[PDB]
């Protein structure tokens, strides 16, 4: 019912199917034409150092792709910056320009997902909006193998970053109260500066072997409402635990800010039945997301 | 541990 | 995480945010406001906007007269002379059938079950935008969020064609099977589980009476939570019976889900429904995966 | 029941 549905109101972006290529080496994935240049993420020609290098050849390898042709891009100049392959249009309008986040692995908050897709109902290529949250670089919105380029903006349009990586389950420690959890797919962004919220950021993409979180993905405030909702119902001043930091990267000056005080305590010692019982309909990992809807 |  | 969202693709509409005008309606002692909806040539405004019974709207309306007395409704835009009241929606010609680009129509919407998108207009504190939300409907009663002013809102499938335009809501329903007039298992809810409601553009609306649904105050009475059949049965399956052993249909089906005979045989996911019964509030109340209950009879398990 |  709507008394679970977020409803998160996204602006609409008004934003051709052009703006997310379909690229093809022969691999596939999806280009990023933002503000005059094309981004396309490197491992379209290999996941490997070696096979990379060797397949891209110095930007040799782009001739040698499919819907990237230079009467649109000016391949000559492309620029292979950190894991990201840039390439300036021609007309650098021919694409309009879009909002960009000042900050965006700092974001925290509901997000939308944008990829091009053929429509086989409809017969044509059409983009494809789709809705999630993110948190920190890390995503819920389902992807599968291609789908690499889709393009991530916050609620108000502006642009966070491109879809890149993910797991099937994730390992979690700081261990933790999250270690024993028994699947938690990963979802993983890259700016266009190539900030990406992984170890060794400047070859994740051909040396990352596991995905390590802290915790699922949560809001800090959403958190601790819900916190407070399950252990303290009459929310009496209790001091912060240091568990909120391991298991929730929760800091005290946050814990202080919002005021929704928690027996952790209590929170441990009924931990599988707050975890695998709705709050309202509910769920755990949508409450601390979304907070309680109320 | 995928690239997509 | 991405286990537990149904992350539904929609197709990006190239809508101008004048689709959804807010049009506002404003006497000595009142204001009224919802949004029209700007469907092929025509803008649709729905009647009570002038009021809530027949005698207020009317007085208020004038025969089209009120039209006159409400912003953003210019005589520019629209043919106000050539206005038309059909069943409980006001429709008036463009003057310029071409100034917003045309959309997509569900040809049969109250029979749609799925995901869905809310389109409304709204204004930015640095200008007016259109604005999507995403969620869930059956039979032309849905799952997002709406507050008082949201009427008008335009609801599409994800293949973008239109469905209807949003138009009531409750804090509540009832829980009973009307077509036997029997209780079923959702009877005993016990939380609130609102409504929200759609009127198609052909005045199509799923309740009771619909010719002047809008004059009138009823409860709202639903068989069950929001559901897919497809879902639902997915769903039951995997919790009552793992290994998929064919087992007979349980008549209680169609009485707690509204599923029938022939649906369950033709999908092929079986149930032990005692187990089910027996466990109910367990079921209910913890969830598969990180999924809920009711998420689950919506989108599926989403493996 | 009530009209939005």
Known sequence: ?294 | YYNQ
């Open chain 1, 1 to 294: 019912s709507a008394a679970s549905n977020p409803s998160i109101s996204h602006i609409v972006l008004e934003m051709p199917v052009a703006i997310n290529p379909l690229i093809k080496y022969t691999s596939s994935l999806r280009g990023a034409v933002v503000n005059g240049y094309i981004y396309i993420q490197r491992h379209l020609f290999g996941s490997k150092k070696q096979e990379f290098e060797a397949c891209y050849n110095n930007g040799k390898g782009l001739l040698n792709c499919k819907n990237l042709e230079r009467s649109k891009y000016d391949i000559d100049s492309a620029e292979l910056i950190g894991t990201l392959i840039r390439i300036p249009l021609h007309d650098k309008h021919s694409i309009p320009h879009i909002s960009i986040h000042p900050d965006p692995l700092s974001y925290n908050g509901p997000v939308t997902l944008y990829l091009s897709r053929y429509d086989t109902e409809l017969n044509k290529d059409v983009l494809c909006v789709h809705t999630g949250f993110m948190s920190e670089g890390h995503h819920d919105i389902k992807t599968v193998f291609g789908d690499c380029g889709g393009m991530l903006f916050d609620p108000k349009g502006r642009l966070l970053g491109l879809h890149c990586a993910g797991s099937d389950d994730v390992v979690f420690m700081d261990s933790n109260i999250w270690t024993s959890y028994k699947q938690h797919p990963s979802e993983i962004m890259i700016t266009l500066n190539n900030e990406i919220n992984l170890p060794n950021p400047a070859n994740y993409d051909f040396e990352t072997t596991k995905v390590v979180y802290q915790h699922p993905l949560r809001n800090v405030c959403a958190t601790l409402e819900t916190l407070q909702h399950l252990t303290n119902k009459t929310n009496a001043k209790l001091p912060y635990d240091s568990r909120l930091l391991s298991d929730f990267n929760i800091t005290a000056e946050q814990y202080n800010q919002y005021g929704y005080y928690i027996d952790y305590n209590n929170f441990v010692n009924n931990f599988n039945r707050y975890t695998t019982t709705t709050i309202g309909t509910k769920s755990f990992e949508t409450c601390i997301k979304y907070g309680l809807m109320d």
